[PDB]
């Protein structure tokens with residue numbers, strides 16, 4: 001039975017310059033190159049905070065439709081969506097900006113909801129720190145430390161909840177459509193109900209248990225790496241008659257993704273011209289842009305150049 005790599009991201013391993021930092025960095029790079037994702041042991045968020053954030057996700061999604069629609073009409077980022085009798089979700093945009101989180105909380109609860117605001121802000125800050133460390137290891141593995149600070153300037157962080165109602169049957173119940181994330185990195189907590197399912201480069205499907213967190217690569221990091229890393233296709237398939245709520249943390253660039261020239265060579269011609277993230281995400285949620293959801297090569301930034309394995313030699 002296939003399984004994603006399992007990487008120990010406990011804070012005791014994340015001290016830069018140490019032996020454990022180097023061994024984790026090697027495993028992160030290998031996993032994101034081959035699988036594009038891995039199971040992660042993450043202790044930056046206590047179990048108590050993880051369940052509290054889960055409760056806040058339910059509290060938010062329990063709100064009336066018209067209240068949740070106040071968060072805007074951008075489902076590609078934080079806007080509310082739902083499919084009848086199937087799923088629903090929305091996001092808290094810019095979760096690391098306390099002023100925006102306060103504003104969001106008072107928009108949903110005009111009387112105030114201090115417990116909601118403090119909980120989701122504390123969680124978004126802690127997961128952003130894990131995201132920052134993972135990006136730092138990836139940059140080190142490519143020898144691009146000199147570009148790291150500029151790449152992380154004004155990083156946009158998103159906290160997103162998706163809830164899936166009880167499928168009413170055992171066995172496999174498709175619950176979320178196949179896609180690639182357009183993030184830099186995505187960190188997922190399945191809140192003890194599995195369903196997130198990945199395809200491998202070889203066409204095999206891997207459905208992890210809910211034991212650990214899941215870290216996966218988005219198309220922004222893939223494009224930055226000039227295709228040297230893999231952004232994996234993934235979907236949600238319920239495999240039990242029980243409801244599910246996912247807690248996901250996305251990182252996005254300030255605006256523009258550009259492949260460093262150092263990652264372009266003869267065997268790795270430039271795959272993607274620069275592109276802006278908000279434009280790409282909006283396109284993917286249109287009828288005409290559906291083809292880019294599962295393949296960034298369908299987006300206008302694609303150059304038509306051959307992938308590395310197709311280099312003629």
Ligand SMILES: COc1cc(C[C@@H]2C(=O)OC[C@H]2Cc2ccc3c(c2)OCO3)cc(OC)c1OC
Pocket residue numbers: 075076077078081089158160162176177178179180181182183250281284285292293294
């Ligand atoms: C790019 O193509 C897609 C990307 C996402 C993930 C989004 C992303 O990449 O950035 C933040 C995420 C926001 C989001 C998360 C879960 C969602 C959702 C939107 O809509 C309903 O479920 C979900 C898709 O559809 C399931 C999709 O295909 C249309």
Ligand SMILES: [Fe+3]
Pocket residue numbers: 179180181234
């Ligand atoms: Fe996803």
